[PDB]
Homo-oligomer: A and B are copies of this chain.
């Protein structure tokens, strides 16, 4: 089982030597390390938290490059919109190793984008975007994302038969084939759409009105079963204690 990338932010400020802030603009919001006001475990549940309102963010982590050619690609992470978000992204981008991390921005060329996007009551959507022939192609299926304040697990699975699966909280919510669920081409044909020569950076590149979202437990792997295990060892261990602590705070607030 290949682990191309793992990040749990368990080693204090260690993460500040693994991630790079884009300088494309001077006024990007800053991520901070935090487990927020409630959590399952104060230390384990530390992740990157958006710290400023109405800002663009642009922070990224490089890893030893790889190709998903001939293989399964699994992209997984947790997202927690502690602040009860009104409008903002919670998605990740996988970039070719040719990306200059210090110049990353909204129009930098990525391979794949994946994850939750919220904007008002009307948009609660999971993006699955594939870059193909210089276009960023959006999935045609409507996948609802989570919108409460708790930690949710997001998983994208992409297979070399051009099938894909999306999971939320380790449970399937959408499935199918690339050729059907995106408009890449007028008719069937190109079995290589799923495949990228090179993956070298994972970026958080996004916009937020109300800030406070925490990203944790990032995993890039080629094994679906391992992804599921890791999901149960991370999200699955956070879940119940987080909910208990938050119920308790809600009750005290009410009094």
Contacts known (A232-B232, A240-B229); A255 close to B26, Cβ less than 8 A: yes
CB of A6 within 8 A of chain B? Answer: no
What are 11 inter-chain pairs, A to B, with CB distance below 8 A?
A: A10-B11, A12-B13, A12-B46, A21-B183, A23-B183, A23-B255, A24-B255, A26-B255, A51-B191, A225-B243, A225-B244
Q: Please give, as numbers and ranges, the residues of chain B lying within 8 Å of A203 by CB-CB distance.
A: none
A43 to B18, alpha carbons, bound, how many Å? Answer: 13
A197 to B69, alpha carbons, bound, how many Å? Answer: 33
Q: Please give, as numbers and ranges, the residues of chain B lying within 8 Å of A188 by CB-CB distance.
A: 13, 16, 33
Residue in B26, B161, B210 whose CB lies within 8 Å of A70: B210
Contacts known (A12-B43, A16-B185, A237-B229); A71 close to B59, Cβ less than 8 A: no
A140 to B21, alpha carbons, bound, how many Å? Answer: 15
A70 engages B43 (CB within 8 Å):
no
B229 engages A241 (CB within 8 Å):
yes
Q: Please give, as numbers and ranges, the residues of chain B lying within 8 Å of A11 by CB-CB distance.
A: 10, 12, 43
Q: Lowest 7 CB-CB distances: which A-B pairs, in order?
A: A53-B70, A232-B236, A70-B211, A225-B240, A16-B187, A228-B240, A12-B12
CB of A139 within 8 A of chain B? Answer: no
Give the number of residues in A that approach B within 8 Å (Cβ atoms): 70
Q: From residue A88, how far is it (CB to closest CB) to chain B in Å?
A: 11
**Copies of this chain in its oligomeric complex:** 5
For the complex with contacts A55-B70, A59-B186, A70-B212, 7 further pairs of A-B residues with Cβ separation under 8 Å are: A17-B42, A26-B254, A26-B255, A70-B83, A70-B210, A225-B243, A232-B239
Contacts known (A71-B53, A211-B70); A192 close to B224, Cβ less than 8 A: no
A186 engages B16 (CB within 8 Å):
yes
Q: From residue A44, how far is it (CB to closest CB) to chain B in Å?
A: 8
Q: From residue A191, how far is it (CB to closest CB) to chain B in Å?
A: 4
CB of A34 within 8 A of chain B? Answer: yes
| A67-89 contacts to B (CB < 8 Å) | 69-71, 83
A122 to B194, alpha carbons, bound, how many Å? Answer: 22
Q: From residue A255, how far is it (CB to closest CB) to chain B in Å?
A: 7
CB of A124 within 8 A of chain B? Answer: no
A192 engages B17 (CB within 8 Å):
no
CB of A100 within 8 A of chain B? Answer: no
Q: Please give, as numbers and ranges, the residues of chain B lying within 8 Å of A52 by CB-CB distance.
A: 70-71, 160
B232 engages A228 (CB within 8 Å):
no
